[PDB]
Design a protein around this ligand. Structure first.
Ligand SMILES: Cc1cc(CCCCCOc2ccc(C3=NCCO3)cc2)on1
Lengths: 273, 59, 59, 255, 40, 255, 57, 40
């Protein structure tokens, strides 16, 4: 492939460099339209800018935490982090978010990796290997109430059991209701006067719930869960302007008030170098 | 107020004109539908799509 | 049940009206059924809110 | 003697002529078309009013003055009240449509000024409150009036800050969306053909707007000496290939 | 070799090697030739 | 096992079933069809909303009692407010349509009574004043309510005398018009298909009604002993092959 | 596979929507027996409702 | 590839792709045609 062809002096009536940008086109002008060039080859394919590659590496999408401790006398397991959940979503952590929102609709399979590490803040003894249970709780399923409810039987709901310190990995097909996931949605769930506006209404994907299977030892053990997400089989439509201001909320476009100028002011003139 | 054979019966009144016999929304996973076999199976899945057949037999 | 995803309503009204023969009286009832058309799709299995338990059963 | 410059668009019972055009943009290089069966889901036969809905509606005019910040209309909202297009809209459960948008602004060879005319698929607005305040319905359904970016923040309304496109992105990059400029010195109209863009084959026309049309002054209007300091901008829009489905009782929407 | 039955379980996809910027860079209705005048 | 007796008519998104029909009449043995070019005059392409206008609208119900004289509806008037049919009607300059009329009245094998259901092309009514008094507009445009032949003379209204068909002809000869009887002992519905009948290819839908549908009790209703002395009669009507042409601003009509 | 075929107006002596449930059958009635439909395809096989799948986790 | 000798040790079965509701939806002795009268 040639990156530049050889081109010499020109004295024409045919001027490729004068255009009318009002038309909305970006005319494909090249170095050889306005200087004299020599042949050179590309030596490159643009492999690593493919959208599959761009969205295809694992990104941290969520960090939560649960603890193993005596539940005796706990009136609210959920509240003691005896188990915890996560209202699945991919917009909470914002590094991966800016990348996805370069597109309007996106379609992909997900590969999740879950790393779980333990911490023993209060001076301790022997730690017996804890086994985490991650179970997917889709919309309209008995949400779990204690850390050892019938829910955890999970007879119809996919769940994975792995050890703290290890990693769990599995992959979920594209579960969207439509043909693509909306990265943006300028609509409502119905024409009410006070119903929420955005996507949050659209990406009702239910939540994920974690717990330790082990009963309690004499000390307490903090287990912190990190969920990583990798898109595989990516398809993206309609590019948009990149995010300039900071994010404030999952699912709304809102930016913070009295934010700071995002364009760097010159130290000098327009004329400055 | 307690489950009875009677909640399967939609009553009809002689001589009423213009009026309404019954009403329900179509949340097949809840409400009237929920205990029916259809309702009961739909509940093992997260998403549904398709046509429903609703019939009335007169007695 | 979800809003965005909601399916409508079903209602029934007298078109003309029920008329009973002589020597007859009172309410008459309709039985109503529901089943899915061959059209139907269900996907993404999960657990039913229709059954739960507090201790394991025994014999 | 055909120029890129003169054009005629006849759609239904209405025709537009421009003698000073700058080509026309067809979003994503695709022209509006009806919904194919292979893509269909709802089993209902759809209704295609054709020429009674696919004609040109001219919205009420705006006034560009030296202080203008820009205006924003949403589709199909802007047309919610135009003739039979609008009726069909409130009466069917689902509908789908593409449009021809023609923005008009003429001046003289002594004026200067340049407007950006851009179509943004799925333009989800931001609340000026920050945090996770929502933007109420009425605020994102201005109707033919559209939203005036130089109007004041209101409560439950969107933010109207132009350098941020009403969503946290910079004005400068709006050029990645199908758009055309109106530079008084070149141009006097802008025309964009919009194919139907959605993640579902057909949708509700009232709970979801699928494009915002935005006209933004970028090089300020400068009139000749002792000229009146303003020009009107007119927007005429025509639904094209419209289809409605799931007819019934007639939606009632807030406000 | 896929070891698994479902398609979601396969590795990343392979390069589009599609690449056609004209839907974005030249969505004009009447074709513009480089070198010919922009507005005739 | 097909009987003349059971029938199903599906039109648009609406279906009717009768288990006690008496065949169906198709006026003048012709079925509704669109307007051919060879017969066309107006050069405008017409709009054919199809399934959104060609469905069944059920008008409000009447009550047959022993004192009833008969009721009269005019078309397209009776439908002037039904869904998108009506909108189209007020919004185009010209329109054209055929209809399926289904009149319903069920009783039991102890009742007796017989209604005449007849369609009269161009039913010009008479003033009860005599002389050359006219019948004002409002009076001949009752809408879905229709005209109740047992209501009182009003001023500027038509005469409501049944033995004279509201025009100086005898009830007995209405049988020369497409018609069907509903005899409680036989029948429970009447169905008539009306092709478009006019002296022009397309006309105005508001200044001229082209058929009156008339339901007239002829053998008085007789209920079984100690039965309630009345039965409701319901009329459901569906425009078929409708076409509208000459779209614009939306007619404003008296009252 | 078609999920719905195209079907238009009907004025028949052949009524598929009237049945006798006393018989114990569920007659296979479809949208196209009572409204006007357009063609649409299924795009789906019913894979995840197989009893092997239902009892297999 | 089965690594084991016994049939019980193989993975899940594969979709019946059988599907015939008529034993459940139409177990009537004399065949009913849709459109023909239910009771003659
Ligand atoms: C946009 C957009 C895209 C996504 C991701 C959707 C992923 C589908 C649901 O995700 C899961 C997560 C976990 C599990 C799980 N099953 C057993 C253990 O974890 C299943 C599906 O979220 N927002």
């Amino acid at each position: 492939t040639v990156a530049s062809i050889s081109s010499g002096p020109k004295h024409t009536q045919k001027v490729p460099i004068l255009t009318a940008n009002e038309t909305g086109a970006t005319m494909p002008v090249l170095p050889s339209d306005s200087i004299e060039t020599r042949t050179t080859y590309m030596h490159f394919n643009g492999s690593e800018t493919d959208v599959e590659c761009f969205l295809g590496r694992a990104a941290c999408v969520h960090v939560t935490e649960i603890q193993n401790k005596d539940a005796t006398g706990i009136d609210n397991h959920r509240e003691a982090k005896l188990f915890n959940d996560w209202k699945i979503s991919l917009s909470s952590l914002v590094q991966l978010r800016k990348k996805l929102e370069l597109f309007t609709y996106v379609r992909f399979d997900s590969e999740y990796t879950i790393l779980a590490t333990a911490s023993q803040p209060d001076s301790a003894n022997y730690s017996s290997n804890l086994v985490v249970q991650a179970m997917y709780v889709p919309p309209g399923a008995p949400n779990p109430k204690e850390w050892d409810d019938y829910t955890w039987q999970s007879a119809s709901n996919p769940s994975v059991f792995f050890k703290v310190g290890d990693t769990s990995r599995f992959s979920v097909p594209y579960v969207g209701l439509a043909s693509a996931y909306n990265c943006f949605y300028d609509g409502y769930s119905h024409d009410d006067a006070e119903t929420q506006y955005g996507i949050t209404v659209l990406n009702h994907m239910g939540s994920m719930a974690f717990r330790i299977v082990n009963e309690h030892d004499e000390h307490k053990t903090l287990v912190k869960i990190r969920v990583y997400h990798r898109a595989k089989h990516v398809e993206a439509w309609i590019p948009r302007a990149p995010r300039a201001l900071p994010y404030t909320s999952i699912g709304r476009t809102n930016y913070p008030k009295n934010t700071e100028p995002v364009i760097k002011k010159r130290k000098g003139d327009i004329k400055s170098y | 107020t307690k489950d009875e054979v009677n909640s399967y019966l939609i009553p009809l009144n002689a001589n009423r004109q213009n009026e309404q016999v019954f009403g329900t929304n179509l949340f097949i996973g809840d409400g009237v539908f929920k205990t029916t076999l259809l309702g009961e199976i739909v509940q093992y899945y997260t998403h549904w799509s398709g046509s429903l057949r609703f019939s009335l037999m007169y007695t | 049940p979800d809003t965005y995803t909601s399916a409508g309503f079903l209602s029934c009204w007298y078109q003309t009206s029920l008329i009973l023969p002589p020597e007859t009286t009172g309410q008459v009832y309709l039985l109503s059924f529901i089943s899915a058309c061959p059209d139907f799709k269900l996907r993404l299995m999960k657990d039913t809110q229709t059954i739960s338990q507090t201790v394991a059963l025994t014999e | 003697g055909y120029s890129d410059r003169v054009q005629q668009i006849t759609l239904g019972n209405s025709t537009i002529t421009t003698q000073e055009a700058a080509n026309a943009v067809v979003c994503y290089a695709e022209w509006p078309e009806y919904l194919p069966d292979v893509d269909a889901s709802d089993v209902n036969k759809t209704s295609k009013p054709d020429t009674s809905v696919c004609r040109f509606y001219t919205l009420d005019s705006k006034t560009w003055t030296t202080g203008s910040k820009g205006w924003c209309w949403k589709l199909p909202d802007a047309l919610k009240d135009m003739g039979v297009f609008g009726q069909n809209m409130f009466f069917h459960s689902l509908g789908r449509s593409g449009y021809t948008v023609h923005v008009q602004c003429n001046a003289t060879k002594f004026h200067s000024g340049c407007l950006l005319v851009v179509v943004i698929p799925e333009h989800q607005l931001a609340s000026h409150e920050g945090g996770n305040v929502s933007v109420k319905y009425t605020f994102t359904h201005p109707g033919e009036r559209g939203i005036d970016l130089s109007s004041a923040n209101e409560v439950g309304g969107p933010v109207k800050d132009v350098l941020y496109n009403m969503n946290g992105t910079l004005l400068g990059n709006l050029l990645i969306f199908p758009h055309q400029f109106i530079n008084l010195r070149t141009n006097n109209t802008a025309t964009i053909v919009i194919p139907y863009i959605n993640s579902v084959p057909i949708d509700s026309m009232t709970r979801h707007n699928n494009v915002s049309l935005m006209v933004i002054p970028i090089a300020p209007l400068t009139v000749p000496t002792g000229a009146t300091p303003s020009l009107p901008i007119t927007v005429t829009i025509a639904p094209m290939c419209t289809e409605f489905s799931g007819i019934r009782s007639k939606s009632i929407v807030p406000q | 070799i896929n070891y698994y039955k479902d398609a979601a379980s396969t590795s990343s996809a392979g390069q589009s090697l599609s690449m056609d910027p004209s839907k974005f860079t030249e969505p004009v209705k009447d074709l513009m030739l480089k070198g010919a005048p922009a507005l005739n």
